[PDB]
Design a binder for this molecule. Structure first.
Ligand SMILES: *[C@@H]1O[C@H](CO)[C@@H](O[C@@H]2O[C@H](CO)[C@@H](O[C@@H]3O[C@H](CO[C@H]4O[C@H](CO[C@H]5O[C@H](CO)[C@@H](O)[C@H](O)[C@@H]5O)[C@@H](O)[C@H](O[C@H]5O[C@H](CO)[C@@H](O)[C@H](O)[C@@H]5O)[C@@H]4O)[C@@H](O)[C@H](O[C@H]4O[C@H](CO)[C@@H](O)[C@H](O)[C@@H]4O)[C@@H]3O)[C@H](O)[C@H]2NC(C)=O)[C@H](O)[C@H]1NC(C)=O
Ligand SMILES: *[C@@H]1O[C@H](CO)[C@@H](O[C@@H]2O[C@H](CO)[C@@H](O[C@@H]3O[C@H](CO[C@H]4O[C@H](CO)[C@@H](O)[C@H](O)[C@@H]4O)[C@@H](O)[C@H](O[C@H]4O[C@H](CO)[C@@H](O)[C@H](O)[C@@H]4O)[C@@H]3O)[C@H](O)[C@H]2NC(C)=O)[C@H](O)[C@H]1NC(C)=O
Ligand code: HEM
Ligand SMILES: CCCCCCCCCCCCCC(=O)O
Ligand SMILES: [Mg+2]
Length: 335
């Protein structure tokens, strides 16, 4: 009949480096029914058993796994997790697929809500990723070797054969240009505009071994291991401090860019969207997503309403800090 969802975990008691690829968290191959998706972080945590190996988890499990496995900073974890859960999870069973649809999330919600997982395109998952292709081309979730070859090429050209912040700036812009030129449905606004800059520094801040204190750069071997194989590097130690999107501002500054998309189902036709969230208007992202949730859940009652109210509040607790203060919205009132 349903779960009563607990508030998110706080930061871990211990926030230093440690071995995370350890005997208790072995890489294992996929079994029948195991779900993986567009996030290499969550994929790796699932494939090492930091998350349930089937790739379906509670918000609380995701937050603790990202903290334990990578030292993802607590508020960043809260912002990402409840965004994903509100839009793509089952609020009654409190389960989120890190990939596509699965009976493992339990009885479906009332449409147009779907609990279809992180693979669902258009409000969270979006275009111009590093190792995943745009949904327009037919597969937004699988590793794409051609795109990884470009990652390697840009690492050779700008990072001495490694991925570093200079490479991130160049690759992000070039990937936007690829999508402008080839994807007539290309969108780069609202949630995606914000998440696309953070995702380009996560490999530097979180995939580079935490024992490396200076000149942080990711080898192509380690990159392939995580992005393709969902496997921690041998002897991997997590970041020595909680971390998330440090340096994302510099990635944007290297090639200033404005939220928008290709208009009128045509390539090379990018039009700015002045109403979109951007990095000096972050609260628009909060308002936009609350609106999206109302479209998914036009008139909830009972346990569904209760769990929506709670999850919206949990998300706001992270957003309020991460975005430097946003007025909380109450689309369904209070408990
Ligand atoms: C991601 O990874 C990449 C790749 O690893 C990494 O790139 C390195 O980035 C750093 C900067 O962040 C680079 O280091 C800097 O290089 C600057 C450019 O150097 C060129 O020009 C120099 C200046 O020349 C003057 O004099 C000549 C006359 O001889 C004249 O023609 C010019 O017009 C000019 O006036 C020159 O010195 C330099 O050449 C030397 O070094 C090369 C070897 O690279 C050698 O072949 C030459 O014979 C010569 O010894 C080169 O041609 C440079 O200006 C800059 O200098 C500043 O800092 C140093 C010390 O910090 C001070 O001494 C100096 O006063 C300056 O203030 C600095 O050295 C580095 O070269 C990149 N490496 C590679 C391989 O690309 C990114 O940083 C990474 N990103 C992150 C975020 O980590
Ligand atoms: C892995 O990921 C890669 C990279 O995203 C996918 O490859 C891309 O696939 C798409 C779809 O086939 C390609 O898009 C098409 O590109 C044509 C132009 O290509 C040239 O120009 C680019 C640079 O701008 C070069 O990189 C490329 O090598 C070519 O020289 C366009 O003409 C096409 O447009 C036509 O169709 C659209 C859609 O209907 C219309 O809007 C247009 O008006 C037009 O008629 C189209 O956009 C894209 O070029 C591919 N990129 C690369 C680098 O290969 C893989 O499919 C994917 N595969 C898997 C399974 O891993
Ligand atoms: C906390 C919960 C998390 C959620 C809900 C989440 C969700 C997502 C989603 C939906 C994408 C696809 C983005 C898109 O196509 O637009 C993505 C990409 C990504 N995530 Fe996660 N993520 C989380 C945590 C993490 C962590 C901890 C890391 C790093 C350790 C990470 C690293 C990445 C990277 C690098 C990408 C880009 C992949 C690519 O472009 O090739 N994420 N994530
Ligand atoms: C891929 C996981 C992250 C997705 C969720 C990120 C949404 C907001 C990112 C941070 C934007 C600025 C906030 C900050 O700097 O603290
Ligand atoms: Mg994507």
């Amino acid at each position: 009949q349903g779960v009563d969802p607990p508030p998110p975990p706080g930061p871990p008691s211990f926030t230093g480096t440690k071995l995370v690829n350890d005997a208790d968290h072995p890489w294992q191959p996929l079994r029948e029914g195991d779900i993986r998706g567009p996030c290499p972080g969550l994929n790796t945590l699932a494939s090492h058993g930091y998350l349930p190996r089937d790739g379906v988890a509670t918000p609380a499990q995701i937050i603790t796994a990202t903290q334990e496995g990578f030292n993802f900073e607590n508020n960043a974890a809260i912002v990402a997790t409840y965004l994903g859960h509100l839009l793509n999870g089952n609020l009654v069973t409190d389960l989120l697929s890190i990939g596509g649809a699965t009976p493992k999330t339990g009885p479906p919600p009332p449409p147009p809500a779907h609990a279809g997982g992180l693979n669902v395109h258009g409000t969270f998952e979006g275009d111009a990723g590093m190792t995943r292709a745009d949904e327009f081309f037919g597969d937004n979730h699988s590793f794409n070797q051609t795109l990884f070859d470009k990652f390697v090429d840009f690492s050779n050209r700008y990072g001495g054969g490694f991925y570093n912040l200079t490479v991130a700036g160049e690759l992000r812009y070039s990937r936007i240009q690829d999508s402008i030129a080839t994807n007539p449905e290309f969108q780069f606004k609202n949630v995606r505009f914000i998440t696309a800059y953070g995702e380009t520094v996560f490999p530097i801040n979180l995939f580079v071994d935490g024992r490396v204190t200076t000149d942080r750069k990711l080898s192509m071997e380690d990159a392939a291991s995580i992005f393709r194989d969902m496997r921690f590097p041998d002897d991997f130690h997590r970041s020595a401090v909680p971390a998330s999107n440090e340096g994302a501002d510099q990635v944007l500054a290297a090639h200033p860019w404005v939220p928008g998309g290709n208009a009128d189902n045509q390539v090379n036709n990018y039009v700015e969207d002045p109403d979109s969230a951007d990095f000096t208007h972050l609260c628009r992202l909060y308002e936009f997503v609350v609106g999206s949730v109302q479209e998914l859940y036009p008139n909830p009652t009972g346990i569904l309403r209760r769990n929506l109210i709670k999850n919206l509040h949990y998300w706001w607790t992270g957003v309020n800090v991460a975005f430097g203060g946003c007025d909380e919205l109450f689309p369904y009132g209070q408990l």
